[PDB]
Write an enzyme that holds these catalytic residues in place. Structure first.
Site, PDB file in Angstrom:
ATOM      1  CD  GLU A  27      10.081  41.220  29.986  1.00  0.00           C
ATOM      2  OE1 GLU A  27      11.182  41.185  29.378  1.00  0.00           O
ATOM      3  OE2 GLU A  27       9.096  40.497  29.670  1.00  0.00           O
ATOM      4  CD  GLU A  61      14.859  48.263  28.133  1.00  0.00           C
ATOM      5  OE1 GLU A  61      13.832  47.958  28.782  1.00  0.00           O
ATOM      6  OE2 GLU A  61      15.295  47.584  27.174  1.00  0.00           O
TER       7      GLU A  61
HETATM    8  C1  CUX Z   1       8.542  52.815  33.393  1.00  0.00           C
HETATM    9  C2  CUX Z   1       7.580  53.941  32.988  1.00  0.00           C
HETATM   10  N1  CUX Z   1       6.420  53.786  32.304  1.00  0.00           N
HETATM   11  C3  CUX Z   1       5.899  52.641  31.834  1.00  0.00           C
HETATM   12  N2  CUX Z   1       4.607  52.392  32.094  1.00  0.00           N
HETATM   13  C4  CUX Z   1       3.987  51.258  31.577  1.00  0.00           C
HETATM   14  N3  CUX Z   1       4.769  50.434  30.774  1.00  0.00           N
HETATM   15  C5  CUX Z   1       6.048  50.731  30.528  1.00  0.00           C
HETATM   16  C6  CUX Z   1       6.621  51.838  31.015  1.00  0.00           C
HETATM   17  C7  CUX Z   1       7.891  51.847  30.573  1.00  0.00           C
HETATM   18  C8  CUX Z   1       8.086  50.767  29.840  1.00  0.00           C
HETATM   19  N4  CUX Z   1       6.939  50.083  29.801  1.00  0.00           N
HETATM   20  C9  CUX Z   1       6.653  48.830  29.089  1.00  0.00           C
HETATM   21  O1  CUX Z   1       7.553  47.906  29.641  1.00  0.00           O
HETATM   22  C10 CUX Z   1       7.653  46.847  28.674  1.00  0.00           C
HETATM   23  C11 CUX Z   1       9.086  46.263  28.715  1.00  0.00           C
HETATM   24  O2  CUX Z   1      10.042  47.301  28.429  1.00  0.00           O
HETATM   25  C12 CUX Z   1       9.186  45.107  27.880  1.00  0.00           C
HETATM   26  C13 CUX Z   1       9.998  45.037  26.741  1.00  0.00           C
HETATM   27  C14 CUX Z   1      10.027  43.858  25.983  1.00  0.00           C
HETATM   28  C15 CUX Z   1       9.264  42.750  26.360  1.00  0.00           C
HETATM   29 CL1  CUX Z   1       9.295  41.306  25.455  1.00  0.00          CL
HETATM   30  C16 CUX Z   1       8.463  42.811  27.477  1.00  0.00           C
HETATM   31  C17 CUX Z   1       8.429  43.975  28.226  1.00  0.00           C
HETATM   32  C18 CUX Z   1       7.320  47.449  27.313  1.00  0.00           C
HETATM   33  O3  CUX Z   1       6.138  46.819  26.768  1.00  0.00           O
HETATM   34  C19 CUX Z   1       7.092  48.905  27.657  1.00  0.00           C
HETATM   35  O4  CUX Z   1       6.087  49.495  26.825  1.00  0.00           O
END
Ligand code: CUX
Lengths: 625, 307
Positions: free
Chosen positions: A423, A432
């Site tokens: 998501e 995003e």
């Molecule tokens: C896309 C590039 N890198 C990356 N790696 C690991 N996690 C990532 C990330 C970019 C964003 N995120 C994570 O995705 C989650 C998402 O945006 C999100 C936002 C709100 C809710 Cl309630 C669930 C999930 C974020 O947790 C973000 O760090």
């Protein structure tokens, strides 16, 4: 309950009249601050040396009552735009005097009429008052839906009322306001008090006042019909307008004497109260929205920034979101795992950006109701969120779930995946940087793998909102380009605004991205047919996404997933508003741009006139990779 | 004499009765309380002195215009939106509310009694004009012809169905309630300055006059289409009253605080700088046709002798 006030142009005793007015149920009074007939000379002897007090004393009310209960009224003889020089000059001095007295008393607002086309000198004088220090009073411009010349009885035999339609002509009161507010440089202290007549105009004329800062709606006693029991009420078309106005939270002003002398005067107000009670109540979307109406916010960038605990909590409390993700995973497992293999074949399922685990739980809940077996990986780069995951994992999930504390583009994976779930979507879908993420994450998807989501599309629509334009305009900040606030998207619960054209898709992305050489950069041209006269202040953004097959999410109003309050719309402003006449096409251009560190949007209007290109080279706004 | 001790500072109206006793209207346009009052003075030269007068009463609100209803009754244009009728008792000591009807939506600014004397027409800032039944105490008809404030309404001397009106919408309307579209615009060619005051000629039913906001008085022959005009005043012409003389004189008042008196060709005969504030009315003595009485916001009651 309604906030509502009384208009009088005759008050012999403030004390008594205010008491009478409070008794009848009103919250405030609109009254003169000098006697309406008391014309005053400022240049010519002898009348200029008129002795005596020029009005009544400020001692007659508490400062508190002056601040909260009283709305000043310009004296109706004051004509700054008369054709007679002598009158223009007196009227200047008089306007200033009365306005400076309004501010002396600390009145919360002060009414002035727009009742002709040329209000240029009137605007000049008011504006000059506004720039004589930083006092905070409001100015309500009393302007009618229908100019009085266009609602007169058809009784002059040698000057009949024009019986042909005049589309632009019938909107003329809007343009009086537009000219007046444009001259005063879109002051935030100048709002509309819209006076409603006995016969309403055509819908388009009422639709012109969409987006405008209507602080008040003036209802004359004369427009009220009478029901069989003798009480005052309103036609169903007038009721529609009142229901629209209640959504704008306007203060209702009641003007004129009692025509229903069989009943007392609180009845008029009690009707509005009844109408307030009897509106369609606040729905499951519009309960949360309340508070956030036309409130500008920064769009989240959960890649560049690490989201806060309470931020995760907000976007987690939305059951529609996860039942749809559960359903899309439920269906995918079935299509990949035949019933005969429901124990041998274990699906490799990777949540990318797992947050605090709600998509992990939705992935579990889905694998239960489908009766298939799944090995889970939970990738999350926010180490603060990863705390919550590893506590869930030890306390509940066991080694079914491997938590990976990593950026998904850095991670070398132990095995390829059957399904990647994410998501990474914002209010404009790709804002995003979901495309960039899932592209770098594509190398660890099986040759036959699925991404949930598989597709998303952003949508745009042109809007008029002089309210939001001003809201944006007010976001100037020291130590940066003084027009930067216009070159950036805001997330906002768009409320006082007019949608000028049906949303149209802007940018679409697909995962997995088959296309050999990819490139998530983009250029799109949209043409918006506009059927009204209006003023363009920006473009609203929305999005749709396909999780899997028929299972979808949308904030596009026309296909909205019902009850998904998480995501508000986005707003792309423009620097200078653009006049749009009925029948014209608004052509807008959008680019999605990037280098290896930053992604951003740029945009321009090309029809009916050209704007500047907004946010060139992401000077004012970028999204961090 | 059963009245208020103090009369309000700002004198609005001044009208002689057929026998010679002076009617006075007054409002207070400043200070704590913003109301008005009606006063009778069987001694013209005793006015405006309160305790040495024939009768008096307080109105709830101010007094923009009034006029006699014959000999006993007094018709009143209130700030309240009321047309009110006050009538004297038989002794002429009290002044009694006969009716007070709240029918206009803003200030009632002008009123004029029709030739029968059993009907009258009022004008207001709510833009309407109303025809009233003084016996029945009702509005027979209500007309929104104008686009701005109605500044002045004047009944025809003799025809009960005819009257003039004028407004800040720049229109001068000749009305005739007999016609199905009762109103009729009398264009003085251009958009010349706004009409401020009206007066029918008392001997020629085809003639009237009007003053403008630029201080010009004008002579109109209904049908011909603006015979003559003179720049009499330097400011708005507040009122015009023809004398009871055979070939009459025209008193013209203004916000330059000056009375003027004019002839057939609008040439200036008299002029009075006597007031130090706005001149609000004029009324000629029916006992001495050389005499003319003015009131003002300076609270003076001047008595001019006109050659
Ligand atoms: C896309 C590039 N890198 C990356 N790696 C690991 N996690 C990532 C990330 C970019 C964003 N995120 C994570 O995705 C989650 C998402 O945006 C999100 C936002 C709100 C809710 Cl309630 C669930 C999930 C974020 O947790 C973000 O760090």
């Amino acid at each position: 309950r309604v906030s509502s006030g009384r208009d009088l142009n005759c008050v012999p005793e403030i004390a008594d009249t205010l008491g009478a007015v409070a008794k009848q149920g009103f919250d405030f009074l609109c009254m003169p601050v000098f006697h309406p007939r008391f014309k005053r000379e400022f240049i010519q002897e002898p009348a200029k040396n008129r002795p005596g007090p020029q009005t009544r004393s400020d001692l007659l009310l508490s400062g508190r009552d002056w601040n909260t209960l009283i709305v000043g009224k310009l004296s109706p003889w004051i004509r700054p735009d008369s054709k007679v020089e002598k009158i223009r000059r007196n009227s200047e001095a008089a306007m200033l005097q009365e306005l400076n007295f309004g501010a002396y008393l600390g009145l919360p607002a002060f009414l002035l009429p727009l009742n002709q086309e040329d209000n240029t000198n009137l605007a000049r004088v008011l504006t000059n008052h506004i720039h004589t220090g930083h006092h905070s009073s409001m100015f309500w411009m009393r302007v009618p839906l229908v100019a009085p010349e266009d609602l007169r009885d058809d009784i002059i035999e040698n000057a009949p009322t024009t019986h042909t339609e005049e589309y632009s002509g019938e909107e003329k009161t809007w343009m009086w306001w537009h000219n007046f507010r444009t001259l005063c440089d879109y002051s935030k202290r100048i709002a509309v008090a819209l006076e409603i007549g006995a016969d309403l105009p055509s819908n388009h004329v009422i639709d012109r006042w969409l987006g405008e800062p209507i602080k008040a709606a003036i209802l004359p006693t004369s427009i009220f019909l009478t029901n069989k029991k003798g009480f005052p009420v309103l036609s169903k078309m007038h009721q529609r307008l009142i229901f629209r106005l209640l959504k704008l939270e306007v203060q209702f002003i009641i003007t004129g004497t009692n025509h229903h002398s069989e009943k007392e005067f609180c009845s008029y107000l009690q009707y509005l109260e009844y109408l307030s009670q009897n509106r369609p109540p606040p729905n499951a979307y519009e309960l949360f929205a309340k508070g956030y109406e036309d409130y500008l916010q920064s769009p989240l960038q959960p890649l560049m920034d690490n989201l806060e605990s309470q931020t995760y909590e907000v976007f987690e409390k939305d059951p529609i979101k996860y039942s749809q993700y559960q359903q899309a995973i439920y269906k995918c497992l079935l299509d990949r795992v035949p019933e005969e293999e429901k124990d041998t074949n274990v699906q490799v399922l990777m949540v990318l950006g797992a947050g605090r685990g709600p998509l992990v739980n939705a992935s579990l809940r889905a694998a239960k109701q489908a009766d298939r077996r799944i090995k889970l990986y939970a990738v999350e780069k926010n180490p603060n969120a990863v705390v919550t995951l590893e506590n869930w994992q030890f306390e509940e999930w066991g080694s079914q779930v491997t938590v990976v504390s990593s950026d998904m583009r850095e991670w070398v994976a132990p095995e390829k995946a059957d399904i990647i779930v994410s998501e990474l979507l914002g209010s404009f879908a790709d804002n995003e940087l979901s495309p960039e993420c899932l592209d770098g994450a594509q190398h660890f998807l099986k040759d036959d793998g699925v991404s949930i989501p598989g597709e998303y599309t952003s949508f745009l629509a042109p809007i008029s909102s002089s309210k939001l334009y001003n809201e944006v305009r007010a976001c100037r900040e020291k130590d940066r380009d003084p027009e930067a606030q216009f070159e950036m998207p805001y997330v906002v619960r768009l409320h006082n605004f007019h949608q000028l054209s049906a949303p149209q898709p802007c940018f679409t992305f697909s995962h997995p991205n088959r296309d050999p050489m990819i490139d998530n950069n983009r250029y799109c041209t949209l043409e918006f047919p506009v059927e009204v006269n209006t003023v363009l202040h920006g473009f609203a953004g929305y999005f749709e996404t396909v999780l899997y097959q028929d299972i979808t999410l949308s904030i596009r109003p026309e296909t909205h997933s019902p009850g998904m309050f998480s995501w508000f719309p986005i707003l792309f402003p423009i620097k200078q508003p653009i006049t749009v006449r009925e029948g014209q096409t608004i052509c807008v251009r959008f680019w999605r741009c990037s280098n290896s560190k930053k992604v951003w949007y740029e945009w321009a209007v090309t029809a009916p006139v050209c704007s500047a290109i907004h946010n060139p080279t992401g000077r004012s706004y970028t999204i961090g990779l | 004499p059963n009245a208020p001790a103090c009369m309000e500072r700002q004198l609005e109206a001044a009208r002689y009765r057929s026998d010679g006793a002076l009617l006075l209207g007054a409002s207070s346009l400043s200070g704590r309380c913003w109301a008005g009052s009606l006063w009778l003075f069987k001694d013209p030269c005793a006015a405006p002195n309160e305790g040495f007068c024939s009768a008096g009463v307080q109105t709830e609100a101010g007094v923009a215009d009034l006029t006699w209803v014959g000999e006993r009754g007094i018709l009143v244009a209130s700030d309240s939106g009321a047309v009110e009728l006050w009538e004297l008792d038989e002794n002429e000591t009290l002044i009694v509310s006969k009716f007070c009807k709240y029918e206009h939506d803003d200030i009632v600014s002008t009123v004029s009694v029709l030739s029968s004397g059993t009907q009258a027409v009022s004008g207001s800032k709510d833009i309407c004009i109303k025809v009233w039944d003084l016996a029945q105490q009702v509005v027979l008809s209500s007309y929104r012809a104008h686009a701005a404030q109605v500044t002045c309404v004047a009944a025809s001397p003799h025809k009960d169905s005819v009257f003039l009106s004028c407004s800040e919408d720049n229109r001068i309307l000749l009305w005739d309630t007999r016609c199905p579209k009762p109103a009729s615009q009398i264009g003085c060619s251009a958009p010349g300055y706004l009409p401020t005051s009206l007066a029918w000629h008392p001997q020629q039913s085809e003639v009237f006059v009007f003053g403008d906001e630029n201080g010009t008085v004008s002579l109109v022959d209904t049908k011909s289409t603006c015979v003559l005009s003179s720049a009499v005043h330097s400011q708005c012409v507040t009122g015009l009253v023809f004398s009871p003389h055979s070939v009459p004189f025209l008193a013209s008042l203004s916000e330059d605080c000056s009375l003027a008196v004019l002839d057939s060709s609008l040439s200036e005969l008299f002029r009075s700088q006597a007031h130090r504030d706005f001149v609000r009315d004029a009324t000629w003595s029916p006992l001495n046709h050389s005499l003319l009485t003015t009131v003002g916001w300076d609270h003076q009651v001047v008595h001019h002798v006109v050659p």
